[PDB]
Design an enzyme around this catalytic site. Sequence first.
Site, PDB file in Angstrom:
ATOM      1  N   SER A  43      -2.660   9.527 -26.771  1.00 46.21           N
ATOM      2  CA  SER A  43      -3.951   9.405 -27.477  1.00 46.21           C
ATOM      3  C   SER A  43      -5.147   9.806 -26.624  1.00 46.21           C
ATOM      4  CB  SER A  43      -4.170   7.956 -27.978  1.00 46.21           C
ATOM      5  OG  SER A  43      -3.359   7.823 -29.107  1.00 46.21           O
ATOM      6  N   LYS A  46      -7.305  12.619 -28.059  1.00 44.12           N
ATOM      7  CA  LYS A  46      -8.378  12.438 -29.025  1.00 44.12           C
ATOM      8  C   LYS A  46      -9.735  12.698 -28.348  1.00 44.12           C
ATOM      9  CE  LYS A  46      -5.977   8.894 -31.851  1.00 44.12           C
ATOM     10  NZ  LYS A  46      -4.577   9.026 -31.270  1.00 44.12           N
ATOM     11  N   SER A 284      -7.956   3.881 -31.397  1.00 50.61           N
ATOM     12  CA  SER A 284      -6.906   4.934 -31.285  1.00 50.61           C
ATOM     13  C   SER A 284      -6.264   5.246 -32.620  1.00 50.61           C
ATOM     14  CB  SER A 284      -5.914   4.530 -30.223  1.00 50.61           C
ATOM     15  OG  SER A 284      -5.279   5.736 -29.774  1.00 50.61           O
TER      16      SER A 284
END
Lengths: 453, 453
Positions: A43, A46, A284
Amino acid sequence: MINVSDLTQKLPEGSNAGVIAKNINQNQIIADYNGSTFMLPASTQKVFTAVAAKLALGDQFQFETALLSNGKIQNGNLDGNLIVSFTGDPDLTRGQLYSLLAELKKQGIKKINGDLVLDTSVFSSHDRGLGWIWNDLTMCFNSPPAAANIDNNCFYAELDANKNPGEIVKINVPAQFPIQVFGQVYVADSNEAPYCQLDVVVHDNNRYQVKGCLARQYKPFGLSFAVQNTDAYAAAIIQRQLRKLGIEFNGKVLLPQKPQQGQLLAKHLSKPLPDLLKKMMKKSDNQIADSLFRAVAFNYYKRPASFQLGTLAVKSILQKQGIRFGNSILADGSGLSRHNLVAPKTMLSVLEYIAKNEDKLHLMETFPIAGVDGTISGRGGLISPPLVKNVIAKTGSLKGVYNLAGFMTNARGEKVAFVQFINGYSTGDLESKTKRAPLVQFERNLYNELYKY
Amino acid sequence: MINVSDLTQKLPEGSNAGVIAKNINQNQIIADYNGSTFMLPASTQKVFTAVAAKLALGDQFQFETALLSNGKIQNGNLDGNLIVSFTGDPDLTRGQLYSLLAELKKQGIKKINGDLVLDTSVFSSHDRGLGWIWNDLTMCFNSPPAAANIDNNCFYAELDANKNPGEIVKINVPAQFPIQVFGQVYVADSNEAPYCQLDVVVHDNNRYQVKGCLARQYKPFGLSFAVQNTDAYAAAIIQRQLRKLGIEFNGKVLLPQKPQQGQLLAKHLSKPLPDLLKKMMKKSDNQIADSLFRAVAFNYYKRPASFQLGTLAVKSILQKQGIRFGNSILADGSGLSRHNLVAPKTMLSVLEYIAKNEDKLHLMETFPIAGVDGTISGRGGLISPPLVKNVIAKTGSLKGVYNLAGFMTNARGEKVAFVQFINGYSTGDLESKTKRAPLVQFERNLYNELYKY
């Protein structure tokens, strides 16, 4: 520099780390260990999506869900089709959709004479990134970031496994969901219980086959799943809602691939980009990430967006700002793909861009803050001074992967940007719980070294 | 020791390599670079399956596909059900199954009065490893290693896309396959073509929807697809073959999911284990690997085998022979899972076991031989002297991963066992063809250094 090699002796045998950190005020690298090695970013990917979305969509961007028709309204009938346009809003609730449809009632439409047509044309190709693992696709965290997305494309079933070994668990789908769960799961004794797997097999039209076993549990509990066919689920909910509203509807569901032209009847707009980014980064949120990833491409290239066009857009946008990706693989916005390949120094160059342009971008406040909020509110290595309330970082966690990317203030009041990727972390089986104690020791020591260096 | 770190300067930036080698004659490790780091083994994982299968199943093992009934044969009629038992044979052809069913005609059956019942009970849970990537599950190479496996669970179809932009591609599926391929894929012009994706979407009962577009093609565009519902496909084939044999059948197809008792009518035996292992090791056959992985577990634990029982059996059988797996992750027998994690030194221990026990195991002759056969017959880095005809090695290739595990003779005539894992190899975008020239230079160098050390 910091001896990161010494620190990684407390990580589990077999793991690999890449760590790089720069004191921004001194423009000095202060740790650099496998910083050019491609690793799985999970993640922390991102962060790329956050920067690209700020740049290409901007702070006033909102996702639109709209009702259109070419029919004329006439004595309370809509004499044509109802078009519902979904554009990937990852934060659309079933209540919002209902309030949207209630606009037709406010306009005096009591009856729709034609068909229900969904326009999902802003996204193209599959709604799953390449390299995503098949068996996670029924998990709610991996629900499809499709054009139609209602209540996070997740539902749940009610289970009653308070039964003797050998007996069948009771599994019912709540009334609100247009889903079937079929198959049988049996309760395993204490001697088979640690071996148990509940298998979930997807069939067409949101029918889920369950097989396998579960240990007894006294209390009834819910298990969440991802919706698979998002167009069928949205069309089913729309028709339930038209009934609740008293709008008579007796037509078919049509799912064309092209944009559907028509006159605008009503529209619902999502919260604007900064709110979506904040939730994405703090919590997340994969769906927000992958929706923005393709909304970036759709807006940037003015054409329906696949995950491949998402990759081309995010790289093209960040390249224009000076970021260099070499042969990195960015297969999605979320980080879920096992094909993703990013080196620590590339992620650091984006963190440096976010720090340098904070006055315009305002992305610093989207990072989870140690011992305070997001996915590091209780992170063990970070919850004491001088790290708590100070370290801010996006986590990336997947099977075997424990990453952080973020910033901290050092003992002199200078800002340090840092990327920590740890992959291959295994202390037990497939489907064992992983001992986090080595990770807590490593991170406590690394971020204390960065603070004092 | 060999300076492998410098050799890796020839590999693409961002790649990671794990290399260990032992001179067996000297009992000396001569290369040890990231030798304890867990990496993806890809098809070198099949080496573990080969040893476990030799030990637990033995050289006489054959897979059995059988016809059973409870009825009496009277008056040319089988007065009961026809049970067909499948046990994972990965090398069963449609012609073999037809010849097996022809045996019912030799026994004078011209009609079956009851139902067709399949017994696939020897395998349980999913027929895919956890951690396999979803988008490859339609590809033949990744066909499911299920109990029912006919012509490798693969079929071919052709798209005629030699037409003008805007026209619909014609889909041609040979008549023998009981599957459907449908959809409207269009030819795109040269401007749109770079933006196209040709996708397949799997629907219930082996119905495949093709979608998207592609540039005009100037030869027929083949599709090789994996069969998705392997019991449906086998029951469909059985009924076509019964019809072509002139055996009347009018009953239901039943899939009871438990073992089916009956009188044995006829049994087809595969080729025995050494032939299976030679094909698996030379040609890198994923279905032979995962079928043997679960067959080992069925025979070792005497119960239906899932992939989890395959991992328990392979580790249990190898641990008794002295292999130590630590916290490796072995999620399948083929190496396809992106969850697999093994260090080079653990694979080297298995290769030493293979060489030490060659008089009993006879596994050396299954490894591909450089410039001669299997998957390294034209491996660029190994096709010149002193490597050609000398290095023998099992390959492991997946996106991003270029591995070899095997043996060679050095300039002194001493035997060297070696493991090379490379992961993170990327030379361009996700969909491009990987550039092998760096791999070729790295391998030529490495194996020359091992030959001369």
